[PDB]
Amino acid sequence: GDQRFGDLVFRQLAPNVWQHTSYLDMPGFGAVASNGLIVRDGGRVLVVDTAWTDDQTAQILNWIKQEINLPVALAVVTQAHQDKMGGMDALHAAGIATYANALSNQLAPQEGMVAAQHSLTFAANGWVEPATAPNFGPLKVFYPGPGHTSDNITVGIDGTDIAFGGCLIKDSKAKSLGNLGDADTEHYAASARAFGAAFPKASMIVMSHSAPDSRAAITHTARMADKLR
């Protein structure tokens, strides 16, 4: 059963992994879910993505103390948008080390976001430069190329069958891709596929704006993006 905490909802996905869900009632469309991850690794917790706001991200941190009771070593934030980086201030106040794509960190100011404290960079093949992600333990970071945004990154969880597509991958039942101005409609499909190819054993795909899916989300996402070529 999903567990409630204030305005947030947590679902356990593995022994060592949870999905956090927070919501924003942006007028025009109603109530809007966003999902990130919490990972326990030995005696520390790692957070992927904040909630919509500082308050809500506070809530997350409180729930972590209450339910897991281990210190939050680092967060990785996956896109320069409110639903992934809206609670950076809360992470910083609590002494959590924050990491994001250098491009994400560059776009943040103009987006009204607070930059992560550290910047990640990527090799030509999409894998994060080891030196920029020290002591990430089970978190495997991959840049698949431009997709929903120029900056979207993805995360796999070694030891588990889970991979995080962030805002790149949409549910396998999506009727539209919901690409906006900042979407790269030329490379989207190949970027979706590259993520699939990077995490080839992952059976459960977690995503920002939908409940976790099978590998069908990847191939449906790719097919929807081909149509925009």
Side-chain angles (χ1 to χ4, degrees):
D2 287 355
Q3 177 165 350
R4 298 255 292 183
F5 190 101
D7 310 299
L8 316 174
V9 175
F10 308 74
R11 182 164 145 181
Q12 185 164 23
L13 299 177
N16 298 355
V17 175
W18 293 259
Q19 175 186 252
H20 64 84
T21 303
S22 60
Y23 308 92
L24 213 44
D25 320 327
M26 208 59 203
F29 297 116
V32 181
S34 145
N35 296 303
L37 285 158
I38 299 153
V39 180
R40 174 174 48 218
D41 161 56
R44 68 207 183 126
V45 173
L46 315 170
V47 173
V48 171
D49 279 342
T50 80
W52 292 99
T53 72
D54 279 319
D55 192 67
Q56 288 167 359
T57 298
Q59 286 186 41
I60 293 194
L61 293 196
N62 286 311
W63 177 97
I64 295 187
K65 181 85 211 172
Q66 190 176 280
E67 275 283 282
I68 303 165
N69 186 25
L70 299 158
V72 177
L74 68 90
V76 189
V77 289
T78 65
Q79 202 200 129
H81 269 65
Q82 189 183 357
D83 48 324
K84 288 67 197 254
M85 288 177 75
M88 298 302 301
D89 277 344
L91 298 180
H92 295 143
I96 307 158
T98 53
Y99 294 86
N101 178 5
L103 181 36
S104 307
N105 285 340
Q106 187 167 0
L107 294 173
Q110 72 195 65
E111 280 321 307
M113 288 298 106
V114 165
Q117 287 166 344
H118 319 272
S119 274
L120 308 160
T121 56
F122 297 90
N125 70 5
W127 291 106
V128 61
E129 280 303 330
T132 75
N135 291 333
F136 262 38
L139 295 197
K140 288 298 177 226
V141 185
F142 179 82
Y143 179 67
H148 177 78
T149 61
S150 270
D151 64 312
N152 53 27
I153 55 152
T154 67
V155 211
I157 309 159
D158 214 29
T160 89
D161 323 298
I162 301 160
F164 184 57
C167 257
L168 173 77
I169 313 295
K170 307 312 199 196
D171 120 82
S172 56
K173 301 138 181 54
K175 287 174 281 283
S176 79
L177 188 51
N179 54 286
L180 291 164
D182 50 334
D184 183 341
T185 50
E186 169 69 40
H187 303 101
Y188 201 142
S191 292
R193 291 195 175 108
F195 164 78
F199 307 112
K201 286 160 167 196
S203 75
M204 170 191 280
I205 308 289
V206 185
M207 310 164 274
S208 266
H209 292 312
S210 215
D213 205 341
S214 60
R215 298 184 69 78
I218 300 182
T219 64
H220 179 79
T221 290
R223 190 225 181 58
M224 282 195 298
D226 280 355
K227 289 166 184 203
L228 292 177
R229 289 296 252 105

